[PDB]
Amino acid sequence: DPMVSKGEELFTGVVPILVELDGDVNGHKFSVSGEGEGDATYGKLTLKFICTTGKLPVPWPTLVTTFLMCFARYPDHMKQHDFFKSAMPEGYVQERTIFFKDDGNYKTRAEVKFEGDTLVNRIELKGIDFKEDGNILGHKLEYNYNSHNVYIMADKQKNGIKVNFKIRHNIEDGSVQLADHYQQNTPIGDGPVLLPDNHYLSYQSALSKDPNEKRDHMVLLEFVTAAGIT
Numbered sequence: 128d129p130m131v132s133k134g135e136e137l138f139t140g141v142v143p144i145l146v147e148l149d150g151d152v153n154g155h156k157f158s159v160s161g162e163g164e165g166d167a168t169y170g171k172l173t174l175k176f177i178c179t180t181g182k183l184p185v186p187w188p189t190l191v192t193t194f195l196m197c198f199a200r201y202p203d204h205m206k207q208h209d210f211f212k213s214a215m216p217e218g219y220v221q222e223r224t225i226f227f228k229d230d231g232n233y234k235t236r237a238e239v240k241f242e243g244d245t246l247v248n249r250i251e252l253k254g255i256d257f258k259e260d261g262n263i264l265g266h267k268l269e270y271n272y273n274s275h276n277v278y279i280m281a282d283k284q285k286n287g288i289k290v291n292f293k294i295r296h297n298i299e300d301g302s303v304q305l306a307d308h309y310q311q312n313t314p315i316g317d318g319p320v321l322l323p324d325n326h327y328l329s330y331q332s333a334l335s336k337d338p339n340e341k342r343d344h345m346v347l348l349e350f351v352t353a354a355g356i357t
Contacts, residue, residue: 130319134212138167138197143245144174146194152254153231153264155184161194163347165246167212170200170351178343185254186268187345188296191332192308193223193235194347195248199328201353208323208356210279210288210312216241217316219287228305231257240315262296262304269297272332276355281322287313288323326355 146161163174172195176187183190197211211219218240225233237250257264273295282289290310295303314320328351335346 128207130213130321131206134209134215135206137215137241138212141166144172144195144248145242145245146174146176146248146250148190148194148250148252150252150254152185152233152252153257153259155264156180157184159183159190159194165195165198167198167200170198172198172347172349172351174347175337176345176347181343183343185263186266186270186296188268188270188272188334189233189263189306190345191272191334191347192225192294193233193237193250193252195239195246196221196328196351197239197246199351199353205326205353205356207321208326208353210321210323213321214314214316217314217318219312219314221310221312223308223310226307227263228307230261230263230304231255238315262298267298267300268304269299270334271297272334273297274329274331277328277330278325279323279327280325282311283322285311285313286320286322287311324356326353328353
């Protein structure tokens, strides 16, 4: 399929990634930069993020979803369902509202696209109605992350997709903080895209710290595999 070929050819090896985030949660301003690489053949991404404005005013885990679905490993039998690659290199817009149960909400807008050989994810995040002493502004979330399926459907009237999913962040008392994600992606370009049948992406995320790093940061290792169209 010369279409599957175009996106294929962009992701076949190891692709450098750059991430930039401008954040404001309850007027706590911040900026994050990330660098790493993805190898979609293996569904694999390796990233390191730095708060370049000093202390991050929210827990790092809360940002993981916001900080690259074009790097999902879509099995051969499913390559006709990979919207994300199909929009490249022009890219796509990924918008979310993330509702933290009994707390605030993030609203994010990202543009994911190639700048030359580099895959770039430029994000703006606005957080409002947070409790200054809740789980998020009070930094009560554990530095870890659970595995999760993410459900993708077509949004044919918007030439895009809709993604809907829940993340449960572990709180240090042993309870969980639900973060209910609503998501929409739409291609940046005017060209054809692959609009998928319902399927899901399976995510595993491991968070760690660079022992030589003094700044406030997060090392993220993610594996993402499409499924659910057997």
